[PDB]
Design a protein around this ligand. Structure first.
Ligand SMILES: CCCCCCCCCCCCCCCCCC(=O)OC[C@H](COP(=O)([O-])OCC(O)COP(=O)([O-])OC[C@@H](COC(=O)CCCCCCCCCCCCCCCCC)OC(=O)CCCCCCCCCCCCCCCCC)OC(=O)CCCCCCCCCCCCCCCCC
Ligand SMILES: CCCCCCCCCCCCCCCCCC(=O)OC[C@H](COP(=O)([O-])OCC(O)COP(=O)([O-])OC[C@@H](COC(=O)CCCCCCCCCCCCCCCCC)OC(=O)CCCCCCCCCCCCCCCCC)OC(=O)CCCCCCCCCCCCCCCCC
Ligand SMILES: CCCCCCCCCCCCCCCCCC(=O)OC[C@H](COP(=O)([O-])OCC[N+](C)(C)C)OC(=O)CCCCCCCCCCCCCCCCC
Ligand SMILES: CCCCCCCCCCCCCCCCCC(=O)OC[C@H](COP(=O)([O-])OCC[N+](C)(C)C)OC(=O)CCCCCCCCCCCCCCCCC
Ligand code: FES
Ligand code: FES
Lengths: 99, 159, 242, 188, 113, 7, 46, 50, 153
């Protein structure tokens, strides 16, 4: 339909300012399709940061904190005297390292 | 596809001809690289119409000290690996020839050693040996603008 | 698959074939501007038509949309640490999801700061313009772009601005506002990208207002009346106050 | 075109000299700028036509530059190679070559590596009238050609003012403060 | 080979074909990994077969210029590389035609004017 | 070593 | 120290920019590890 | 990694490596400080448990 | 133990949730006054015996983590909420909500977390009748037992 109320008719092409999403791929003028564009570097920065740095340096600490906070470090609670009992240690062997 | 003016290329490199400047503009280099390539090609006598292949990557006509007007062919090379060397006799880039016997006539290859007494001072773009290194250090260096650099400081008493 | 007859498909095939045949690489244009004065190119055959320091004049750290996210980060970290909502083990980690994705808008903004033009020269021939920009980490980028690629945007940058009739320069000749220009194809660092928007800040010096206006309006400028100034003032990697 | 020409009468141009000044004022070997005008356009363009533009004075690279007495603008941007001056004992009447490029392996002196880099920075061959300890410039930016005039302090301040330099210095400071915090909390 | 590290930390001797029940889990994962490796081996041989159906002449990526010791070598490589890529991108439509074909792909509408 | 356990 | 000496000590290769950018991020990634290690050391002592 | 993943490919600002051979200032000395510390650590720990 | 600590924390949360009576409030006030004075307002390293110093510092560390740090965190959360509100309202970065609202949040939450965990800190001072700290705690404990008509440890 031509005349629809509430809709602005598109008389001319709109700029890139109005785009909701930013393309990570482009076209060379001779038809070559660029997958590795300058936008791809900025898009890959957060994924690489999380995979290489953030996950490998916080995941085990989070796991141990949650294990102590919720599971009481896996204690067998039916024990008599804390001062005479061995301590159920929190998690100490990192599972996010290869060894 | 941004082409430098052939007149401007001729002006920057005075001895270069119109056809060479136009052909250089018809290559894919950015205008800075177009002017630089024109400078190099004119100064070293490079033939810019020579198509790069796996026999020789470049051709250059130069007159020696006896005025013989010889030609020099810059070969296609390989990095330490004859197995990666394209031993071909065609002006093409592909590796079509496969030789079962690399040294067919049993003639050995050679790595010529140069006598130190018979060496010559480096003049094949000698000013580029450290270039890369320096340019890797100056990319992350911030330089004080001349508006802020102190000037006309007092002279040293003994110099 | 091809034996199925679709008129829209046939029209698309005809359009593609006709564009391949009739539309050529070499396109004739009548947008030519002849400046009223002699153009004084530098020793490198290009006249500086715009200069600025976009990073110096921009707010880098305390920008409103992003300080909000970066100030919300500690709240999420505290909510995970103390668990005031008495959530299970998975829900608190879902809370911890947020700090990883809250600095990304600032990354995009800091990237956008490098698309504000720092320098623009007009090369000889009047068909190429050299654009120099600089990132927030000191990297410098140079791009040669044809003059016809430039399309001015409006003041609000929401819609395209009419070429051949647009006033982004005041009466004196300086920029009236931060002008947005869209480029159909910009080759940045050797990779072609489509529909790239660049900005000319108001706090920037517009040398040669006629040449700047012609370049932005996508004109092929006639540089026949020229002189060359043999001034070797500049140097490579010259300090520029960012 | 027509719209630009309508307003072109009132447009005013601005000078192109910004944060760089004039090289010929602060540097010898650079002739003052000369306005070269093109000749008449050629009637016929031939494939073997060399340029007809007026010739330009060509100054070769000097082997070394003299001591410019407190007025030294580097011909090209040098590598800093240190923000501290050397305290070197110079003998009276002995010719010293000072490294201007900054890439010399032989400390402050030229060695030979300026010939192996793309730069117009040539060594400053100078002679002192009296032997003694001198502050030889090592940032290669001093107005005194081989001597230190405390320009390295300005260079350090400018580096700190930059966004990336500010981040670098604060990151190093926070690394050291993390070491200090660990040492302070070592008994908890 | 990571679950083998896990089992080694738990006290698993080497040359035993029967082990305590508490190891089986990681051992299964380890065995899984081996089979993944085997699949990769299959692909290896497949590519060799696929390499002789293809029957193409190899072209060196260096174009005969392994080292850019000088900027003239960089220029020669850049020129030859651009010519080579232009020759490769023949029979593949330009950017405008390709975008026209991609954007106008959908040709299924119920009602027309 | 000296401060390997860091605490 | 000596910028030129420290900019080509590592086999004549320049990684000084990445070394400089490493300190800022490395100043914070060790905090969770350090605090949980404090917890583990206290548990061992107990 | 970021640099080599973002700015070292041919289409993203490659470098003209013009260096014939490396000239280093105490190379291995910097590359052996980190391992040596490790050795120290390991040795000390072993001795204690021994 | 972790189970003992979790049980203490959750029982304190339940007690604070249900209410605190009147005589319980009086006993809590006595316990809080004793703990505040003898631990927070005193340098625990100034006690004569090593047992007193060690266990008073343990009690002070428990106070620091369970009252000081928790109150700082909750006040900082309140300050962050107010800061986000003010940043959204002013469409720019502001700094006033951090100090003032952080201090107000700390002053609001420190009494809450002290009232919640008063018994925990009071009992941790039970070093024995042989020491001055233990004698004072036992005097306060006898007063609280008189108030609540019960017997504690
Ligand atoms: C320790 C320092 C302390 C003092 C700091 C002082 C200021 C420092 C910054 C100054 C500027 C330095 C240069 C920056 C990059 C410039 C280059 C560029 O083009 O950038 C665009 C560029 C986009 O890519 P590009 O332009 O295509 O290519 C880059 C260049 O071409 C070529 O560039 P390149 O390749 O050479 O360089 C690559 C490098 C370039 O980047 C850097 O060098 C940046 C290094 C880190 C900077 C950290 C300081 C940020 C300064 C602003 C803070 C404002 C605070 C006040 C306002 C908000 C709070 C109220 O990339 C990276 O480092 C990778 C991304 C690293 C992200 C780190 C995120 C930390 C988050 C911390 C908060 C969350 C913690 C918990 C969760 C943890 C896991 C996420 O962006 C980046 O690369 C950087 C991305 C990250 C930027 C935003 C960081 C936000 C931090 C928020 C902290 C909030 C704390 C909690 C609240 C506290 C108050 C209540
Ligand atoms: C509002 C802001 C106020 C800020 C005030 C200044 C900060 C003071 C902190 C003091 C902490 C301290 O000394 O603890 C010693 C304390 C020593 O314990 P202890 O001596 O054995 O005795 C335990 C106490 O009796 C009983 O200890 P507890 O069971 O009560 O443990 C609670 C303690 C546990 O301590 C912590 O949680 C310390 C903070 C952990 C890291 C915070 C984020 C850092 C991110 C850096 C980049 C990572 C990549 O948390 C606090 O005290 C936190 C108070 C402030 C909360 C709000 C902080 C917001 C800004 C954070 C920056 O340390 C611990 O208990 C360690 C437990 C936690 C281990 C790590 C857990 C995960 C950490 C990473 C979280 C996520 C980050 C990455 C997000 C993205 C992931 C993909
Ligand atoms: C030596 C090097 C080792 C590592 C080298 C690299 C190889 C390994 C790479 C791993 C990559 C990550 C895999 C796991 C992913 C999930 C994380 C996880 O479950 O961790 C467990 C941990 C621990 O979980 P837990 O609390 O259950 O701990 C286990 C507890 N026990 C052991 C007691 C059972 O969980 C978390 O850390 C959860 C919080 C983080 C969630 C992050 C979500 C956001 C991700 C953002 C991505 C980047 C931005 C994208 C932006 C896009 C914008 C459009
Ligand atoms: C190098 C390897 C890096 C990636 C390791 C991935 C996790 C491996 C694993 O099984 O870890 C055990 C850990 C489990 O920790 P756990 O075994 O210590 O659990 C303690 C709790 N009990 C003892 C009761 C079971 O796995 C995870 O935490 C999984 C997290 C999500 C991983 C997603 C990967 C994709
Ligand atoms: S002048 Fe510096 S290396 Fe020679
Ligand atoms: S080193 Fe001091 S001014 Fe150069």
């Amino acid at each position: 339909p031509n005349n629809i109320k509430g809709l602005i008719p598109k008389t001319c092409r709109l700029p890139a300012t109005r785009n909701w999403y930013r393309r990570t791929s482009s076209f060379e003028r001779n038809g070559f399709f660029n997958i590795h564009t300058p936008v791809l570097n900025t898009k890959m920065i957060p994924w690489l940061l999380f995979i290489v740095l953030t996950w490998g340096w916080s995941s085990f600490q989070i796991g141990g904190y949650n294990y102590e906070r919720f599971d009481d470090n896996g204690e067998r609670r039916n024990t008599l005297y804390w001062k005479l009992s061995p301590v159920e240690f929190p998690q100490s062997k990192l599972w996010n390292r290869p060894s | 596809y941004c082409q430098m003016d052939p007149e401007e290329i001729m002006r920057r490199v005075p001895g270069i001809t119109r056809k060479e400047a136009e052909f250089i503009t018809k290559l894919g280099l950015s205008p800075q690289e177009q002017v630089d390539f024109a400078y190099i090609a004119y100064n070293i006598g490079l033939d810019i119409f020579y198509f790069t292949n796996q026999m020789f990557v470049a051709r250059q006509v130069v007159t020696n000290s006896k005025g013989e007007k010889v030609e020099v062919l810059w070969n296609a090379q390989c990095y330490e690996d004859i197995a990666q060397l394209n031993v071909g006799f065609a002006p093409v880039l592909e590796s079509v020839d496969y030789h079962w016997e690399i040294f067919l006539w049993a003639d050995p290859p050679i790595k010529p050693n140069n006598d130190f007494d018979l060496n010559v001072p480096c003049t094949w773009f000698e000013y580029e040996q450290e270039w890369w290194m320096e340019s890797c250090i100056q990319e992350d260096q911030f330089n004080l603008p001349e508006d802020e650099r102190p000037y006309n400081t007092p002279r040293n008493p003994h110099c | 698959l091809n034996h199925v007859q679709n008129m829209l498909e046939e029209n698309l095939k005809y359009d593609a074939q006709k564009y391949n045949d009739e539309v050529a690489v070499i396109q004739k244009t009548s947008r030519i501007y002849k400046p009223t004065y002699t153009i004084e190119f530098n020793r490198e055959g290009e006249v500086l038509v715009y200069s600025a320091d976009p990073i110096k004049n921009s707010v880098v750290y305390f920008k409103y949309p992003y300080v909000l996210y970066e100030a919300a980060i500690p709240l999420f970290i505290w909510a995970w640490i103390y668990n005031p909502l008495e959530l299970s083990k998975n829900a608190v980690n879902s809370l911890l999801i947020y700090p990883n994705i809250a600095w990304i808008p600032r990354m995009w903004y800091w990237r956008s700061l490098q698309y504000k033009i720092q320098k623009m020269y007009l090369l000889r021939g009047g068909k190429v313009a050299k654009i120099e920009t600089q990132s927030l980490a000191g990297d410098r980028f140079t791009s040669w772009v044809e003059t016809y690629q430039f399309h001015p945007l409006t003041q609000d940058q929401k819609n395209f601005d009419n070429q051949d009739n647009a006033e982004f320069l005041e009466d004196e000749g300086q920029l009236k506002y931060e002008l947005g220009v869209q480029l159909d194809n910009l080759q940045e660092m050797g990779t072609t990208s489509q529909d790239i928007v660049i900005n000319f800040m108001k706090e920037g010096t517009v040398h040669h207002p006629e040449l700047f206006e012609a370049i932005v309006k996508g004109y092929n400028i006639d540089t026949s009346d020229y002189v060359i100034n043999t001034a070797n003032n500049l140097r490579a990697r010259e300090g520029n106050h960012n | 075109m027509s719209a630009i020409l309508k307003r072109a009468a009132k447009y005013k141009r601005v000078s192109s000299i910004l944060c760089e000044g004039e090289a010929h004022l602060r540097d010898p070997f650079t002739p003052p700028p000369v306005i070269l005008k093109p000749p008449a356009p050629r009637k016929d363009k031939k494939p073997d036509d060399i340029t007809d533009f007026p010739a330009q004075k060509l100054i070769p690279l000097p082997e070394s530059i003299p001591y410019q007495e407190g007025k030294y603008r580097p011909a090209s941007i040098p590598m800093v190679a240190g923000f501290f001056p050397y305290n070197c004992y110079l003998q009276q009447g002995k010719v010293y070559s000072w490294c201007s490029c900054g890439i010399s392996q032989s400390g402050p002196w030229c060695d030979g590596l300026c010939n192996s880099v793309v730069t117009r920075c040539r060594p400053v061959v100078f002679n002192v009238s009296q032997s003694g300890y001198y502050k030889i410039c090592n940032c290669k930016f001093s107005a005194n050609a081989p001597f230190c005039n405390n320009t390295h302090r300005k260079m350090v301040r400018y580096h700190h003012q930059t966004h990336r330099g500010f981040y670098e210095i604060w990151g190093a400071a926070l690394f050291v403060l993390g070491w200090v915090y660990m040492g302070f909390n070592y008994y908890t | 080979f990571v679950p083998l590290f896990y089992l080694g930390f738990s006290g698993m001797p080497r040359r035993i074909h029967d082990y305590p029940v508490v190891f089986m889990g990681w051992h299964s994962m380890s065995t899984t990994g081996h089979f993944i490796t085997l699949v990769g081996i299959i692909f290896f041989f497949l590519m060799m077969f696929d390499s002789h159906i293809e029957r193409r002449a190899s072209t060196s990526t260096t174009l005969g210029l392994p080292r850019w010791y000088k900027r003239i070598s960089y220029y020669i490589f850049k020129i030859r590389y651009l010519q080579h890529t232009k020759s490769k991108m023949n029979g593949i439509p330009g950017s405008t035609v390709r975008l026209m074909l991609i954007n106008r792909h959908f040709v299924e509408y119920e009602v027309y004017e | 070593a000296l401060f390997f356990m860091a605490n | 120290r000596n910028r030129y000496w420290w900019y080509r000590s590592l086999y004549d290769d320049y990684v000084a920019r990445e070394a400089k950018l490493a300190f800022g991020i490395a100043a914070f990634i060790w905090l969770p590890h350090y605090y949980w290690g404090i917890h583990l050391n206290r548990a061992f002592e107990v | 990694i970021l640099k080599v993943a973002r700015f070292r490919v041919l289409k993203m600002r490659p470098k003209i490596s013009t260096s014939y051979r490396p000239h280093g200032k105490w190379g291995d000395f910097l590359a052996c400080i980190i391992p040596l510390i490790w050795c120290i650590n390991i040795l000390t720990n072993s001795n204690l448990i021994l | 133990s972790c189970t003992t600590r979790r049980f203490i924390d959750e029982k304190e949360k339940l007690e604070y949730s249900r209410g605190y009576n009147q005589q319980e409030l009086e006993a809590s006030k006595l316990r809080k006054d004793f703990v505040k004075k003898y631990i927070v307002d005193f340098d625990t390293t100034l006690y004569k015996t090593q047992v007193e110093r060690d266990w008073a510092y343990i009690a002070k560390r428990e106070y620091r983590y369970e009252v000081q740090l928790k109150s700082i965190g909750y006040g900082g959360a309140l300050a962050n909420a107010v800061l986000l509100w003010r940043i959204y309202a002013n469409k720019k970065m502001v700094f006033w909500p951090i100090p003032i609202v952080g201090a107000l949040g700390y002053l609001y939450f420190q009494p809450v977390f002290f009232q919640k965990s008063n018994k925990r800190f009071f009992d941790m001072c039970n070093v024995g009748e042989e020491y001055y700290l233990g004698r004072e705690r036992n005097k306060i404990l006898r007063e609280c037992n008189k108030i609540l008509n019960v017997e504690d440890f």
